[PDB]
Ligand binder design. Sequence first.
Ligand SMILES: Nc1ncnc2c1ncn2[C@@H]1O[C@H](COP(=O)(O)OP(=O)(O)OP(=O)(O)O)[C@@H](O)[C@H]1O
Ligand SMILES: N[C@H](CO)CCC(=O)O
Ligand SMILES: [Mg+2]
Length: 468
Amino acid sequence: MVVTRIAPSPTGDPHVGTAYIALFNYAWARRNGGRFIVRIEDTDRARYVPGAEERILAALKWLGLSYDEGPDVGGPHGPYRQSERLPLYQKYAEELLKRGWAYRAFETPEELEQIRKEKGGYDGRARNIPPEEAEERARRGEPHVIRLKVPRPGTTEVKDELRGVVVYDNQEIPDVVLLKSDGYPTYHLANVVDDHLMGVTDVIRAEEWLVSTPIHVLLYRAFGWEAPRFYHMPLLRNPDKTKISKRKSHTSLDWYKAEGFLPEALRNYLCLMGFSMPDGREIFTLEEFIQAFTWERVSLGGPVFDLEKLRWMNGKYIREVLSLEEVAERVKPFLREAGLSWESEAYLRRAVELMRPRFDTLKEFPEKARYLFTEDYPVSEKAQRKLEEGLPLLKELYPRLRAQEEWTEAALEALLRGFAAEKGVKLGQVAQPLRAALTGSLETPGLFEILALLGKERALRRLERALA
RNA sequence: GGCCCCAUCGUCUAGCGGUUAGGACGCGGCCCUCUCAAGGCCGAAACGGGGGUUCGAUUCCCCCUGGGGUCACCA
Ligand SMILES: Nc1ncnc2c1ncn2[C@@H]1O[C@H](COP(=O)(O)OP(=O)(O)OP(=O)(O)O)[C@@H](O)[C@H]1O
Ligand SMILES: N[C@H](CO)CCC(=O)O
Ligand SMILES: [Mg+2]
């Protein structure tokens, strides 16, 4: 069967690049009735950010992906956190030593720096230390690393399923450190060992790892294991076309959630980075993505992540994909954050309904409809001007309003239409100042539904303060 | 700089020798309308350059140009 994985490093906030790669691994595993694994790559204590792991796992679930094996769902090839697998890499590093595929190197970081300066890159000098001497120095406890002993001279073929074959000259492949002096493996060692042990057959990862692939092909050969298929996805980009970064773009999934973007919309947008539907359709479900997925429709250019298009898509989900009730539920946390309360479920549902076509993120709802939930709302200068100019007309209308018994959208419209007629004025000339009086803004939903919504008492109550 | 990957409107893309090069965001106009949106309609907007292959290149090959990625006891 097919086995894919996402192997996040817990060294910062959940990254949109992780969600993107994760999404394609999830689709390829499901499209093939295979398994999608999550493996936490915490091998660098220096960059480890406590709490990052749970945050990335929760962000993956928030986006709607599910995995079959991982740190919090079990699996037969655990543990799924590399920090708990240390003895294993040790053993494999030592096996490479015995097979003549690796060597112990005792240089200090400062000497490596100097070598890098003189010859640019490590020159493999430790390959000349007699094997027995190396073993003795290790036994005495001398700090050292274990490096991959690249076969030189030589050539290494790497096959990427999307780009074809690339033949590297071994002189281009360094004798990379496999096991660090603190006993931790580097990414190269652990990735091959764990992909093998966990049975991965399809490695789908970002293009930034393409060049490291020949090192991996060599390790699979060194261990006598069959290499999996490799697919390198194009990197998401900032507007300037450089790989997406925290300074030129928003890369934190927590920022998107906090800003009121729907996980379904963000996920749908990410699918469009490099993939397209046969019929050109842009709005589709995760399940539809899985079913239509094919590497034949994956484009290789580096996609610029367009926040404006994400917002349009989010608005599209709010208006056409989710139900009125789902939107009302998702808007609650943002109302709470804004310090606003809603009278009842019916009130909230109706307010959300009136505003649906007017907000593209959940965060915008409390902002643009603030006047629907509190008396503490802003009155724009332009609305203040429309109000003053219409005060006399509103004064004359007020009594006809306090007299209206049936407070319905159809009733109110008739009363207002009539009033504008009898006053020989355009409906707008009475609606705009009234809107300003009820909302403190000149940009809102329809006057009748806004007038109706609050109910007689509340409506007039606010209209009165405006005529004060 | 070495090595590697990539190349259609400003952005995401369709296209797999012959098309008026299509769609989406954004932008402009019009309709709708009590405002603002939403929605509908219309419009401006692309094949980076040079050689070939070929009856015929946006599609196939080569070069150049451009952009990107990568060269850590980071991943
Ligand atoms: N900017 C990016 N654009 C697209 N894909 C990315 C990006 N950054 C990482 N990825 C891919 O997404 C997954 C995320 O891995 P991870 O959580 O460790 O993020 P990372 O940015 O690579 O962190 P680290 O700095 O430790 O390397 C990997 O499969 C990686 O190839
Ligand atoms: N930990 C790496 C991501 O930062 C794994 C990349 C891969 O080999 O898939
Ligand atoms: Mg055109």
